[PDB]
Design an enzyme around this catalytic site. Structure first.
Site, PDB file in Angstrom:
ATOM      1  N   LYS A  40       1.923   5.751   2.755  1.00  0.00           N
ATOM      2  CA  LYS A  40       1.508   4.486   3.275  1.00  0.00           C
ATOM      3  C   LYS A  40       0.002   4.522   4.158  1.00  0.00           C
ATOM      4  O   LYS A  40       0.233   5.017   5.240  1.00  0.00           O
ATOM      5  CB  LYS A  40       2.580   3.737   4.119  1.00  0.00           C
ATOM      6  CG  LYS A  40       2.439   2.356   4.664  1.00  0.00           C
ATOM      7  CD  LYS A  40       1.999   1.522   3.642  1.00  0.00           C
ATOM      8  CE  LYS A  40       1.735   0.183   4.012  1.00  0.00           C
ATOM      9  NZ  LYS A  40       2.951  -0.578   4.421  1.00  0.00           N
ATOM     10  N   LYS A  92       0.580  -1.276   0.114  1.00  0.00           N
ATOM     11  CA  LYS A  92      -0.084  -0.010  -0.078  1.00  0.00           C
ATOM     12  C   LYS A  92       1.027   1.298  -0.154  1.00  0.00           C
ATOM     13  O   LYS A  92       0.441   2.253   0.573  1.00  0.00           O
ATOM     14  CB  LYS A  92      -0.924  -0.026   1.204  1.00  0.00           C
ATOM     15  CG  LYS A  92      -2.260  -0.860   0.899  1.00  0.00           C
ATOM     16  CD  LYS A  92      -3.295  -0.150   0.267  1.00  0.00           C
ATOM     17  CE  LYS A  92      -3.879   1.326   1.119  1.00  0.00           C
ATOM     18  NZ  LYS A  92      -5.073   1.806   0.742  1.00  0.00           N
ATOM     19  N   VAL A  93       2.092   1.011  -0.426  1.00  0.00           N
ATOM     20  CA  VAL A  93       2.911   2.253  -0.511  1.00  0.00           C
ATOM     21  C   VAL A  93       2.842   3.139  -1.977  1.00  0.00           C
ATOM     22  O   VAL A  93       3.069   2.368  -3.086  1.00  0.00           O
ATOM     23  CB  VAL A  93       4.272   1.864  -0.501  1.00  0.00           C
ATOM     24  CG1 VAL A  93       5.373   3.237  -0.591  1.00  0.00           C
ATOM     25  CG2 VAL A  93       4.699   1.478   1.136  1.00  0.00           C
ATOM     26  N   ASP A 135      14.131  -4.428  12.011  1.00  0.00           N
ATOM     27  CA  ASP A 135      14.140  -4.629  10.942  1.00  0.00           C
ATOM     28  C   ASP A 135      15.187  -3.903   9.761  1.00  0.00           C
ATOM     29  O   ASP A 135      14.522  -3.574   8.605  1.00  0.00           O
ATOM     30  CB  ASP A 135      12.558  -4.424  10.404  1.00  0.00           C
ATOM     31  CG  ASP A 135      12.363  -5.666   9.130  1.00  0.00           C
ATOM     32  OD1 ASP A 135      12.726  -6.456   9.171  1.00  0.00           O
ATOM     33  OD2 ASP A 135      11.188  -5.193   8.304  1.00  0.00           O
TER      34      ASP A 135
HETATM   35  C1  LIG Z   1      10.231   8.200  10.190  1.00  0.00           C
HETATM   36  C2  LIG Z   1      10.504   6.824   9.546  1.00  0.00           C
HETATM   37  N1  LIG Z   1       9.215   6.176   8.936  1.00  0.00           N
HETATM   38  C3  LIG Z   1       9.722   5.600   7.723  1.00  0.00           C
HETATM   39  O1  LIG Z   1      10.668   5.731   7.010  1.00  0.00           O
HETATM   40  C4  LIG Z   1       8.497   4.801   6.958  1.00  0.00           C
HETATM   41  C5  LIG Z   1       7.467   4.128   7.631  1.00  0.00           C
HETATM   42  N2  LIG Z   1       6.752   3.732   6.757  1.00  0.00           N
HETATM   43  C6  LIG Z   1       5.693   2.848   7.001  1.00  0.00           C
HETATM   44  C7  LIG Z   1       7.134   3.782   5.489  1.00  0.00           C
HETATM   45  C8  LIG Z   1       6.831   3.486   4.237  1.00  0.00           C
HETATM   46  C9  LIG Z   1       7.251   4.052   2.980  1.00  0.00           C
HETATM   47  C10 LIG Z   1       8.574   4.486   3.068  1.00  0.00           C
HETATM   48  C11 LIG Z   1       9.165   5.192   2.070  1.00  0.00           C
HETATM   49  C12 LIG Z   1       9.530   6.537   1.820  1.00  0.00           C
HETATM   50  C13 LIG Z   1      10.207   6.947   0.894  1.00  0.00           C
HETATM   51  N3  LIG Z   1      10.225   6.212  -0.165  1.00  0.00           N
HETATM   52  N4  LIG Z   1      10.727   6.593  -1.348  1.00  0.00           N
HETATM   53  C14 LIG Z   1      11.010   5.607  -2.239  1.00  0.00           C
HETATM   54  N5  LIG Z   1      11.242   5.536  -3.675  1.00  0.00           N
HETATM   55  C15 LIG Z   1      10.771   4.681  -4.718  1.00  0.00           C
HETATM   56  O2  LIG Z   1      10.224   3.749  -4.615  1.00  0.00           O
HETATM   57  C16 LIG Z   1      11.524   4.904  -5.978  1.00  0.00           C
HETATM   58  C17 LIG Z   1      10.903   4.904  -7.342  1.00  0.00           C
HETATM   59  C18 LIG Z   1      11.819   3.861  -6.974  1.00  0.00           C
HETATM   60  N6  LIG Z   1      10.174   4.588  -1.535  1.00  0.00           N
HETATM   61  C19 LIG Z   1       9.791   5.108  -0.495  1.00  0.00           C
HETATM   62  C20 LIG Z   1       9.290   4.406   0.888  1.00  0.00           C
HETATM   63  C21 LIG Z   1       8.875   4.973   4.396  1.00  0.00           C
HETATM   64  C22 LIG Z   1       8.392   4.400   5.486  1.00  0.00           C
HETATM   65  C23 LIG Z   1      11.306   6.002  10.521  1.00  0.00           C
HETATM   66  C24 LIG Z   1      10.680   5.522  11.582  1.00  0.00           C
HETATM   67  C25 LIG Z   1      11.586   4.697  12.358  1.00  0.00           C
HETATM   68  C26 LIG Z   1      12.896   4.206  11.883  1.00  0.00           C
HETATM   69  C27 LIG Z   1      13.218   4.755  10.869  1.00  0.00           C
HETATM   70  F1  LIG Z   1      14.400   4.565  10.661  1.00  0.00           F
HETATM   71  C28 LIG Z   1      12.434   5.493   9.982  1.00  0.00           C
END
Ligand SMILES: C[C@H](NC(=O)c1cn(C)c2ccc(-c3ccn4nc(NC(=O)C5CC5)nc4c3)cc12)c1cccc(F)c1
Ligand SMILES: C[C@H](NC(=O)c1cn(C)c2ccc(-c3ccn4nc(NC(=O)C5CC5)nc4c3)cc12)c1cccc(F)c1
EC number: 2.7.11.1
Lengths: 261, 250
Positions: free
Chosen positions: A27, A12-13, A120
């Site tokens: 998400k 769901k991203v 993870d």
């Molecule tokens: C605050 C931070 N929480 C998150 O980080 C995320 C949490 N959830 C559920 C997410 C879901 C998707 C993404 C994500 C974000 C950006 N992008 N960018 C691309 N790019 C492409 O796909 C390109 C086309 C090829 N994919 C993605 C996917 C992030 C998070 C965090 C919390 C705790 C520990 C940490 F270390 C970090």
């Protein structure tokens, strides 16, 4: 910090376009029956995610708390995750691979310094921008208790420390993240996932619990001798024998400057 | 490879689904799931080259944008363990033919440079006439499609996921299939058992109560030798077992 679903153009991203701030990642975590008892704790956890402000950690841009629907909004990373970049058909030089390792170390030291256990860490949670700088992400929501709870109301194990395999009640520690960093280290130089020859999950789980590690010989690319010793140090069976991220940064930063950069 | 459409099938029912093709009959469909596509199609093009009377044939592949599926021929009676446990008896002559057909199928795959790596009774399918075909339900041989029990695992792969499987790893699996064919059950009825197997534990031959010819007990022990070097090859097994099957068992 709180946004509305109507703050976004309609598709769901997923890629999302906010009407004023532009391209973002959304998400959506839960789309079921109302459950507003969790809402202050979900909102406080979102505020904790938003206070994780560091160049090597993906920033939470917003949270959507609506009566049936919960979403997190993150900044977009153009090149995807580390494994996709490692496998792209343009090669990644040793100097860029060295920089990536240091940035992963910097990001993980910062998270541990804020009392956050990732739990993870893997190549898919390491995202890359156009300049090949990286940020640590949490795609499966493994890190914050209530959002992980909300995600599961009604994952790969190549990077899981052996003490957690076949053990649902072992509590992840800083040394569990250090284990995962070790296998990520191996992957960065192999340009592929480990354990390609495993036939069965139970074979792989039991093999890893007994001492199997990624095949260091399967790195045919040059991999500096000190980084092989680092990965072996970090995937030690005993967690007490694994170093900390500040300890890893103190040996790896001068080595990166004098040899690799 | 034949590429197929979901609109080519009238009925579906889960069972991996049984599907009814508009012209070609009953088929088995495994719905598995654009970076992937030429290599995903190339693996299927390669699966389709396995053409042998004792190997399940890939009939088609469905590449639809939310959907990736493999279409295999259907085996009416299910897998070997389900057939051995049925209360209709399997005489020694049919068990012998099954053993010979497993050998033919395994020799053919090795002749194509295919190491099965997951031979076990669940991967041995049976038709209405009690003929068998070797299948790969876990997609254990083709990496990317798999990308999308340890009782039969040779001891060199136990607690060692980085060892490269060989033809001799399938011969070990054949040995335990032999035991299961004559006991009519799974053996060893994990870390403790894994280590015992690595030091020499094998399925209990005395637990076979059915009649079992002496040559098949010796073959079983030959094929499950700790040292992979001591195990025969499938063409080697076929030259001893084919005349033995015709003169004694058929
Ligand atoms: C605050 C931070 N929480 C998150 O980080 C995320 C949490 N959830 C559920 C997410 C879901 C998707 C993404 C994500 C974000 C950006 N992008 N960018 C691309 N790019 C492409 O796909 C390109 C086309 C090829 N994919 C993605 C996917 C992030 C998070 C965090 C919390 C705790 C520990 C940490 F270390 C970090
Ligand atoms: C080309 C061939 N690939 C395969 O074999 C399969 C690959 N995948 C993913 C599969 C998934 C399901 C089946 C399957 C096929 C037929 N049947 N028939 C029944 N019967 C009943 O279920 C009950 C009585 C009602 N089940 C089944 C299940 C096969 C395969 C192959 C590749 C490599 C080595 C080989 F040796 C063989």
């Amino acid at each position: 910090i709180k946004m509305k679903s109507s703050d976004f153009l309609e598709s769901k991203v997923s890629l999302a376009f906010h009407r004023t701030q532009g391209l973002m990642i959304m998400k959506t975590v839960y789309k079921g029956p109302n459950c507003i008892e969790h809402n202050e704790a979900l909102l406080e956890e979102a505020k904790m995610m938003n206070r994780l402000r560091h160049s090597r950690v993906v920033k939470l841009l917003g949270v959507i708390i609506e009566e049936g629907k919960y979403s997190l909004v993150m900044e977009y990373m153009e090149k995807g995750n580390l494994m996709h970049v490692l496998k792209a058909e343009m090669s990644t030089p040793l100097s860029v691979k060295g920089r990536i390792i240091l940035e992963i170390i910097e990001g993980m030291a910062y998270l541990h310094g804020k009392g956050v256990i990732h739990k993870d860490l893997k190549p898919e949670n390491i995202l890359v921008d156009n300049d090949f700088h990286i940020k640590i992400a949490d795609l499966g929501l493994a890190s914050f208790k209530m959002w992980s709870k909300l995600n599961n109301e009604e994952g790969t194990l190549y990077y899981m420390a052996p003490e957690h395999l076949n053990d649902v009640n072992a509590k992840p520690t800083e040394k569990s993240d250090v284990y995962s960093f070790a296998v990520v280290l191996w992957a960065i130089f192999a340009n592929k996932e480990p354990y390609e020859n495993a036939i069965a999950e139970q074979q792989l789980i039991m093999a890893i619990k007994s001492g199997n590690r990624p095949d260091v010989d399967d790195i045919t690319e040059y991999c500096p001798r000190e980084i092989i010793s680092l990965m072996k140090l970090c995937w030690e069976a005993n967690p007490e024998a694994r170093p900390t991220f500040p300890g890893i940064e103190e040996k790896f930063r001068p080595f990166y400057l004098s040899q690799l950069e």
